[PDB]
Design a binder for these strands. Structure first.
Lengths: 101, 93, 106, 81, 74, 169, 108, 84, 68, 75
RNA sequence: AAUUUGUUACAAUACACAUUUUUUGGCACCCAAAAUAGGACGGGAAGAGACUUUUAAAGUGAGACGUCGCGACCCUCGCAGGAGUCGUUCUUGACUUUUUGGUCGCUUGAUGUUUCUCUCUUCCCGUUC
């Protein structure tokens, strides 16, 4: 059923369902259980972050997240690690997000 | 140079000569007149400045003098999709 | 998340007690117990500071090799050392072990 | 918005176009919509590499437009009051 | 006039095989039997093979997203 | 009076010079008849505002010096200035024109101050200066100017530029 | 829920807005639009140096950086300092907010 | 205010000519208009100034002045300019 | 005459591969749930481009196609 | 929301560039609000006019997202 | 013997929207170059090598779009964004007419894209230890 038919509260119940029961429930269960998540961006740089908050667009607030990025030129590789205490992440850059055991 | 009001939004500033950055690395400098919801704006007397590939190599880290090829195009209407960031150049007449 | 009165069992010690002797782990607990009050928000800043670290499902504490934990408890003491210190106005050099214990135990 | 209304006010006048592909279409504007997609009449085309041709009629998608150059005398037009 | 998605519905029921070009970055073109489609022009293709750009491997019944669609060609 | 920051601030930077660029500044109450006897001090108050053109015409300035790094500035109008020497390292890459009419610049003093450049300016006027009268002054000015597009309204003649280059060699 | 409403309570804080270009902006933050258009005040915006035997940085971001008019000639590395940059929302990638503020109060 | 020039070198380019004019007229006063709108060339140029006094001075001093070979014939304009 | 959304409703808790548009990487795993936008959740996924991955969330814009 | 106005174009042979590289020529049949354009007797133009040009199919549909400019070679 | 309060209308800001036409990304990659204890670095000029052209003698990696410019055996009269009309009263509105450069060389303007392949010596001027 299309979204333009529903009322103002039916959208709130719809978003509550989608967060509680749905794909993004992987992130929600990760926020409550304090389980660290791995996030791959489009950039190709992967952050190991603990999710304080998330949102519909997938943009999310992470604290203590660690960023891992490697670069190569003519098959000469170097691995670089960067630690930031507080992160707000816009959700359009992410591709895959996994929940660590 | 020029001090913009500490809290000034795109609506607060009108007729100021601006400096507009697009995704392609070129700049449109001129007076802003209107803008829109998705932030495509109208410049009055606008000149697009560009950085030469040889100039771009010079910009790489080591007084630098860049030859910036620019062409004049009056009363344009930009597209919000292309715009990247905006800076203030001067204050109105 | 509990709307009803009930008994629940959990382990405060988790990894550190399992790794390190029992006298010392309570002491590392008490270094922590003082600290989280002095860490209003930097707790989650310092405890998660190493993002490689994860909390075990049964356990409460971040499970780790325990070297940063010695660094964590030391940084946390310095936050306790300054906050106890600033209210009374003491120099950091003037702080001594007998004062540092008096900060810990009082 | 005013920026699109100014494009509607430019109908029947020579305008310039920069597509995000790099080309340049200068010629007379016949139609324009609120989706910014315009169609131009008797228009000289400059390819991204500079090769210039001429075509009688053209329709371009608004999403691909980068900037549009409009006759200067529209600056004082009543939209800006 | 023949609306485009009407034409696609004529690809669904007429059971004609179609070759479909993807975006220029991916470098493969898909071909198969278009079964059904949505409003977003993302289509299910039965008995689809991916050809790099004729040794391509057969895919299956596969849902293909409309964002990457360029051409749908019989 | 002396060229201060306050004066600069006061100056009318509203009417832009529409020939090229923007913000045609005229320092003090009016740069035309400001009477700046000392060198152009407090140049930092402008802070490279904006072919940015500054009109200093009808002022007492002795030396063309004391500038802050100005990237924009392309035009200097210095007419009716008692300029003697104009040696500097600040305004080198910047600037496209220099109008020095009715000043006191020496034929040797003007030549000495520049010290020569591989490329410089593009438009230059030295008219109503003592030096221009001096014998072979045009040849000396062309040799000093090094690269040049104009010399007192008349372009150094292509052949004249070649002969001047030969004299330099 | 729109998490952008969080950023609107971060006003008057030191922040880095790390864009899609790789360009990073340190500055004091002002009102954030509902589209996440972020307007700053006193900002030093730069590009990181991939070392890697001096591999070539972003070619578009260097030009866009020199064309702000804020890059000073004598800067050895690649940076620019300016007042009042206004940033479109879709350009933002990451935002690094200060360590001091507590989330439990602001995330409600 | 405006001063209509005549009898000058047509061989020189437009923009360049305008620039030259500007350079010339900056000594007298603030030049409001860089070049004449008509841009017919061959002498016909209207040097618009801010002050009338300045214009007068210019007229006085630069009457038959050597500019690009030929002597410029200075004179006051009949009608007032569009900018003024 | 199956359409995409009932096709995803029929592929729930079946082994499905999903090819992303970038590196020709495909995640092979048991589908859990999908959103309106066709966001994906997977269990016991494996990344092919060789690894084993416990649980996965895949955003809708990066997927190229979905197969069984 | 609003339908693009191709109404004068349909049934006329039209060239249109697909993406940065491509140029397809065909007789326009139908169009929609996204500019998706279905045309018949499609041909992919290339450098050598008779040689590298190869027909596509009896009916071809184009996603409006890949459309850049649309020129009609015709009245 | 202008201020404040109430009501009505219009305009601006914040309460919206991840599915091909603007703001929840077709994303990212060419690769490689300085270390010492008089010395580097940039710019200009000259010579030579190797390149090109003609049948030993001539200049500096080569081949393609434009961009505004240096010459001219040419054209060209010479003073009016504005102009006219009507309404209306001492300069305003509504309705019509429509830009100098029109060109050619460049006996190398001057200068940016895009493909392929592989510098040393001498002088002059600035910066750094």
């Amino acid at each position: 059923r299309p979204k333009h038919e529903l009322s103002r509260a039916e959208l709130e119940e719809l978003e509550e369902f989608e967060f509680k029961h749905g794909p993004m429930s992987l992130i929600n269960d990760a926020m409550v259980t304090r389980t660290p998540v791995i996030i791959s961006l489009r950039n190709n740089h992967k952050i190991i972050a603990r999710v304080k908050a998330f949102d519909r667009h997938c943009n999310m607030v992470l604290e203590n997240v660690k960023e891992l990025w490697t670069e190569k030129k003519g098959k000469n590789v170097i691995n670089r690690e960067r630690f930031i205490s507080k992160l707000f992440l816009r959700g359009d850059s992410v591709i895959v997000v996994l929940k660590t055991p | 140079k020029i001090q913009v009001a500490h809290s000034s939004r795109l609506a607060n500033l009108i007729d100021y000569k601006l400096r507009v950055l697009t995704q392609d690395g070129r700049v449109y400098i001129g007076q802003l007149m209107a803008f829109d919801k998705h932030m495509n704006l109208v410049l009055n007397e606008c000149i697009e400045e560009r950085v030469p590939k040889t100039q771009l190599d010079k910009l790489r880290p080591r007084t630098l003098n860049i030859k910036v090829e620019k062409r004049v195009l009056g009363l344009t209407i930009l597209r919000g999709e292309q715009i990247l960031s905006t800076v203030v150049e001067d204050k109105p007449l | 998340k509990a709307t009803e009165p009930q008994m629940v069992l959990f382990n405060i010690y988790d990894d550190w007690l399992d790794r390190i002797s029992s006298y010392t782990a309570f002491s590392r607990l008490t270094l922590l117990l003082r600290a989280l009050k002095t860490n209003e928000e930097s707790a989650k800043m310092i405890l998660l500071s190493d993002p490689t670290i994860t909390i075990k499902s049964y356990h409460l504490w971040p499970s780790f090799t325990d070297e940063q934990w010695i660094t964590i408890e030391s940084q946390m003491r310095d936050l306790i050392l300054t906050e106890y210190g600033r209210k009374y106005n003491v120099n950091i050099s003037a702080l001594t072990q007998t004062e540092i214990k008096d900060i810990i135990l009082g | 918005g005013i920026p699109v209304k100014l494009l509607n006010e430019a109908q029947g006048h020579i305008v310039s176009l920069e597509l995000t592909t790099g080309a340049t279409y200068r010629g007379k504007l016949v139609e324009s919509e609120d989706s910014m997609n315009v169609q131009l009449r008797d228009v000289i085309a400059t390819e991204p590499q500079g090769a210039v041709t001429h075509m009688d009629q053209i329709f371009v998608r608004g999403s691909q437009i980068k900037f549009i150059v409009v006759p200067d005398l529209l600056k004082n037009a009543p939209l800006f009051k | 006039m023949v609306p485009p998605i009407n034409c696609i519905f004529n690809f669904l029921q007429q059971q004609t095989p179609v070759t479909i070009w993807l975006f220029e970055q991916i470098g493969i073109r898909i071909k198969g039997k278009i079964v059904g489609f949505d409003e977003f022009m993302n289509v299910v293709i039965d008995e689809a093979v991916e050809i790099p750009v004729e040794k391509g491997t057969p895919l299956g019944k596969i849902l293909l997203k409309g964002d990457n669609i360029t051409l749908i060609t019989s | 009076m002396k060229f201060t920051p306050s004066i600069v601030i006061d100056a009318p930077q509203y009417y832009v010079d529409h020939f090229n660029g923007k913000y045609n500044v005229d320092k003090c109450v009016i740069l035309r008849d400001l009477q700046l006897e000392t060198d152009s001090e407090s140049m930092p108050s402008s802070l490279k505002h904006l072919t940015h053109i500054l009109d200093l015409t009808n002022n007492d300035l002795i030396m063309i010096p004391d500038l802050s790094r100005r990237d924009d500035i392309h035009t200097l109008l210095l007419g009716r200035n008692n300029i003697v020497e104009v040696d500097g390292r600040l305004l080198p890459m910047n600037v496209q024109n220099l109008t020095l009419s009715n000043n006191s610049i020496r034929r040797f003093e003007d030549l000495q101050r520049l010290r020569r450049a591989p490329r410089t300016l593009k438009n230059l006027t030295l008219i109503g200066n003592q030096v221009c009268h001096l014998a072979n002054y045009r040849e000396h000015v062309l040799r000093l100017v090094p690269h040049l597009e104009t010399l007192d309204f008349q372009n150094v003649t292509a052949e004249e530029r070649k002969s001047a280059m030969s004299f330099p060699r | 829920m729109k998490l952008v409403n969080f950023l609107k309570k971060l006003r008057n804080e030191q922040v880095t807005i790390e864009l899609k270009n790789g360009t990073t902006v340190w500055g004091t933050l002002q009102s954030v639009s509902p589209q996440m258009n972020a307007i700053l005040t006193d900002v030093k915006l730069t590009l990181p140096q991939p070392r890697l035997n001096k591999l070539n940085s972003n070619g578009i971001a260097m030009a866009s950086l020199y064309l702000t008019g804020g890059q000073q000639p004598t800067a050895s590395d690649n940076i620019a300092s300016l007042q009042y940059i206004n940033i479109r929302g879709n350009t933002i990638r990451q935002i690094i907010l200060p360590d001091s503020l507590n989330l439990d109060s602001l995330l409600v | 205010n405006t001063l209509y020039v005549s009898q000058l070198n047509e061989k020189i380019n437009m923009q360049r000519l305008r620039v030259n004019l500007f350079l010339l007229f900056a000594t007298f006063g603030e030049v409001l208009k860089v070049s004449m709108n008509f841009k017919k060339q061959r002498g016909q140029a209207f040097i618009t100034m801010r002050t009338i006094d300045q214009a007068s001075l210019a007229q006085i001093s630069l009457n038959g002045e050597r500019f690009f070979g030929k002597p410029l014939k200075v004179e006051f304009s009949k009608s007032e300019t569009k900018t003024l | 005459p199956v359409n995409p959304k009932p096709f995803l409703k029929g592929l729930v808790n079946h082994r499905v591969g999903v090819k992303l548009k970038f590196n020709s990487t495909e995640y092979r795993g048991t589908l859990v749930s999908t959103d309106n936008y066709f966001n994906l959740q997977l269990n016991e996924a494996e990344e092919f481009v060789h690894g084993t991955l416990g649980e996965i969330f895949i955003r809708c814009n990066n997927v190229l196609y979905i197969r069984e | 929301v609003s339908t693009p106005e191709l109404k004068k174009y349909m049934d006329k042979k039209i060239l249109l560039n697909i993406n940065g590289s491509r140029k397809v020529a065909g007789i326009l049949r139908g169009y929609d609000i996204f500019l998706n354009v279905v045309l018949d007797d499609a041909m992919e133009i290339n450098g050598e006019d008779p040689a590298n040009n190869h027909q596509l199919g009896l009916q071809t549909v184009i996603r409006g997202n890949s459309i850049i400019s649309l020129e009609a070679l015709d009245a």
